[PDB]
Write an enzyme that holds these catalytic residues in place. Sequence first.
Site, PDB file in Angstrom:
ATOM      1  N   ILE A  25      -2.006   5.740  -9.538  1.00  0.00           N
ATOM      2  CA  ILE A  25      -1.439   6.972  -8.704  1.00  0.00           C
ATOM      3  C   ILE A  25      -0.547   6.384  -7.406  1.00  0.00           C
ATOM      4  O   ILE A  25      -0.378   5.190  -7.221  1.00  0.00           O
ATOM      5  CB  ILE A  25      -2.619   6.196  -7.538  1.00  0.00           C
ATOM      6  CG1 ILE A  25      -3.880   7.452  -8.276  1.00  0.00           C
ATOM      7  CG2 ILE A  25      -2.839   7.215  -6.738  1.00  0.00           C
ATOM      8  CD1 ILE A  25      -5.494   7.318  -8.003  1.00  0.00           C
ATOM      9  N   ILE A  26      -2.159  -1.474  -5.498  1.00  0.00           N
ATOM     10  CA  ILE A  26      -2.532  -1.677  -7.215  1.00  0.00           C
ATOM     11  C   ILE A  26      -3.333  -0.303  -7.766  1.00  0.00           C
ATOM     12  O   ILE A  26      -4.730  -1.098  -7.969  1.00  0.00           O
ATOM     13  CB  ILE A  26      -2.887  -2.750  -7.273  1.00  0.00           C
ATOM     14  CG1 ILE A  26      -1.020  -3.682  -7.253  1.00  0.00           C
ATOM     15  CG2 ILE A  26      -2.512  -2.693  -9.295  1.00  0.00           C
ATOM     16  CD1 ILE A  26      -0.673  -4.560  -5.976  1.00  0.00           C
ATOM     17  N   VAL A  27      -3.632   1.363  -7.536  1.00  0.00           N
ATOM     18  CA  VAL A  27      -5.099   1.908  -7.988  1.00  0.00           C
ATOM     19  C   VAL A  27      -4.671   3.350  -9.114  1.00  0.00           C
ATOM     20  O   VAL A  27      -2.780   3.630  -9.216  1.00  0.00           O
ATOM     21  CB  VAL A  27      -4.575   2.890  -6.606  1.00  0.00           C
ATOM     22  CG1 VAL A  27      -5.787   3.513  -6.238  1.00  0.00           C
ATOM     23  CG2 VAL A  27      -4.861   1.986  -5.210  1.00  0.00           C
ATOM     24  N   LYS A  42      -9.360   0.389  -7.930  1.00  0.00           N
ATOM     25  CA  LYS A  42      -8.353  -0.333  -6.910  1.00  0.00           C
ATOM     26  C   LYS A  42      -8.701  -1.989  -7.884  1.00  0.00           C
ATOM     27  O   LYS A  42      -9.845  -2.412  -7.264  1.00  0.00           O
ATOM     28  CB  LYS A  42      -8.071  -0.325  -5.057  1.00  0.00           C
ATOM     29  CG  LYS A  42      -7.161  -1.223  -4.593  1.00  0.00           C
ATOM     30  CD  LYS A  42      -8.282  -0.890  -3.413  1.00  0.00           C
ATOM     31  CE  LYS A  42      -6.783  -1.787  -2.319  1.00  0.00           C
ATOM     32  NZ  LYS A  42      -7.225  -1.100  -0.779  1.00  0.00           N
ATOM     33  N   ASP A 138      -5.284   0.854  13.174  1.00  0.00           N
ATOM     34  CA  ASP A 138      -3.961   0.793  11.928  1.00  0.00           C
ATOM     35  C   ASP A 138      -3.891   1.796  11.627  1.00  0.00           C
ATOM     36  O   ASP A 138      -3.889   2.032  10.191  1.00  0.00           O
ATOM     37  CB  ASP A 138      -3.141  -0.920  11.416  1.00  0.00           C
ATOM     38  CG  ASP A 138      -2.349  -0.334  10.751  1.00  0.00           C
ATOM     39  OD1 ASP A 138      -1.255   0.189  11.765  1.00  0.00           O
ATOM     40  OD2 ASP A 138      -1.759  -1.433  10.496  1.00  0.00           O
TER      41      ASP A 138
HETATM   42  C1  LIG Z   1      -8.282   3.375  -3.035  1.00  0.00           C
HETATM   43  C2  LIG Z   1      -6.143   4.144  -2.964  1.00  0.00           C
HETATM   44  N1  LIG Z   1      -5.290   3.349  -2.014  1.00  0.00           N
HETATM   45  C3  LIG Z   1      -4.563   4.299  -1.851  1.00  0.00           C
HETATM   46  N2  LIG Z   1      -4.976   5.555  -2.747  1.00  0.00           N
HETATM   47  C4  LIG Z   1      -6.352   5.684  -2.895  1.00  0.00           C
HETATM   48  C5  LIG Z   1      -7.141   6.770  -3.583  1.00  0.00           C
HETATM   49  C6  LIG Z   1      -8.490   6.884  -3.612  1.00  0.00           C
HETATM   50  C7  LIG Z   1      -9.039   7.524  -4.091  1.00  0.00           C
HETATM   51  N3  LIG Z   1      -8.454   8.747  -4.542  1.00  0.00           N
HETATM   52  C8  LIG Z   1      -6.983   8.991  -4.398  1.00  0.00           C
HETATM   53  N4  LIG Z   1      -6.372  10.160  -5.266  1.00  0.00           N
HETATM   54  C9  LIG Z   1      -4.558  10.509  -5.253  1.00  0.00           C
HETATM   55  C10 LIG Z   1      -4.297  11.299  -6.338  1.00  0.00           C
HETATM   56  C11 LIG Z   1      -3.233  11.406  -6.138  1.00  0.00           C
HETATM   57  C12 LIG Z   1      -2.424  10.928  -5.371  1.00  0.00           C
HETATM   58  N5  LIG Z   1      -0.846  11.540  -5.489  1.00  0.00           N
HETATM   59  C13 LIG Z   1      -0.686  12.993  -5.393  1.00  0.00           C
HETATM   60  C14 LIG Z   1       1.372  12.385  -6.040  1.00  0.00           C
HETATM   61  O1  LIG Z   1       1.662  11.995  -5.801  1.00  0.00           O
HETATM   62  C15 LIG Z   1       1.750  10.809  -5.177  1.00  0.00           C
HETATM   63  C16 LIG Z   1       0.071  10.486  -4.928  1.00  0.00           C
HETATM   64  C17 LIG Z   1      -2.358  10.365  -4.094  1.00  0.00           C
HETATM   65  C18 LIG Z   1      -3.829   9.596  -4.017  1.00  0.00           C
HETATM   66  C19 LIG Z   1      -5.577   7.409  -4.541  1.00  0.00           C
END
Ligand SMILES: Cc1nc[nH]c1-c1ccnc(Nc2ccc(N3CCOCC3)cc2)c1
Length: 344
Positions: A25, A26-27, A42, A138
């Site tokens: 998407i 450290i996730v 995560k 924040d």
């Molecule tokens: C736990 C956590 N920490 C940060 N983000 C997350 C999280 C948690 C749950 N779902 C998502 N879904 C998600 C999926 C795709 C994207 N992108 C699309 C294209 O590329 C850039 C990002 C963004 C979010 C993200």
Amino acid sequence: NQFYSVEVGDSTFTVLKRYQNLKPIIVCAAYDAVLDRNVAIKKLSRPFQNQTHAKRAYRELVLMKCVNHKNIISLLNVFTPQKTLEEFQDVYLVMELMDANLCQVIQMELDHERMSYLLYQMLCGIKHLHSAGIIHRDLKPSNIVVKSDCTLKILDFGLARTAGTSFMVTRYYRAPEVILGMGYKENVDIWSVGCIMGEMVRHKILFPGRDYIDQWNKVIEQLGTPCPEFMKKLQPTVRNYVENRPKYAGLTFPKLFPDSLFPADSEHNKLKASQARDLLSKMLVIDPAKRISVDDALQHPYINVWYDPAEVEAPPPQIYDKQLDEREHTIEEWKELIYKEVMN
Ligand SMILES: Cc1nc[nH]c1-c1ccnc(Nc2ccc(N3CCOCC3)cc2)c1
Ligand SMILES: CCCCCCCCCCCC[N+](C)(C)CCCS(=O)(=O)O
Ligand SMILES: [Cl-]
């Protein structure tokens, strides 16, 4: 073996076999074969580098478990591949998979139904947190995620009250009373909401800058020099630098957010432009004594179109550890506390 390892986005994920097809998407995103749905996983790798990391991890874990609100990310599972407290190292959090981060959503052309709905949901989530004494301080777009249907979830809870307004990366959404070390109340989070709203309209960060000095200049250049009513609530020392800044009248809200940025050529659009600007004028207020509350923002005509008491007026989260924010522990003690939360 209940687990398998895979490299994803240049990190090792060791995860339960139910979680398949891991993708960055450290996730990462994964397919959960047991629930037959996609999830986000995560990895907390270095939650014991120090007490700050450990406290944050423990707090993140305890709160994500205890809070149950549709606008706050919820936990589906927590696990560790390690078998004993002694070997314990990594913590994996599994949650519902959303479609995008608010950063990418901010870049879309302004649509009043979507913007009002996103803001409504942010306000609902913040209201809920505040009711349990969770004041974020924040809030920022990178920690808010959305689904393709515009449903929104806040990803994190900010620091313990014992951190106050100190954070020891993206600083642009922090309120003046945080930047200047003045102390805060619930409506600290309303400034961050305002910053996000403003960026949805402008498609530019409102108050950028390499550091707080630069950021404060961008605040005063745009909103004006704050009043002596504000200056008098500052410590004497900080006040000198703030008082010796060039005086600014500030731009009016019609110049900050001109009609040119808003959908045009209908009376509905004209109305909504005006309402959106009005709400901005009440959120982007330097002095928190003069800034709109969360509850009043939910009554604002721009937002209140969505208002449903069944979503807004849920009972507050009761928190099981009354000293969650205050108590301090050794690394060894934090590690055991976290381990217990992971194993239940
Ligand atoms: C736990 C956590 N920490 C940060 N983000 C997350 C999280 C948690 C749950 N779902 C998502 N879904 C998600 C999926 C795709 C994207 N992108 C699309 C294209 O590329 C850039 C990002 C963004 C979010 C993200
Ligand atoms: C652009 C200029 C930046 C100036 C930085 C100012 C440094 C601020 C430190 C003073 C702390 C004052 N008290 C009231 C004790 C803090 C209360 C706790 S907290 O505000 O909630 O952290
Ligand atoms: Cl499994």
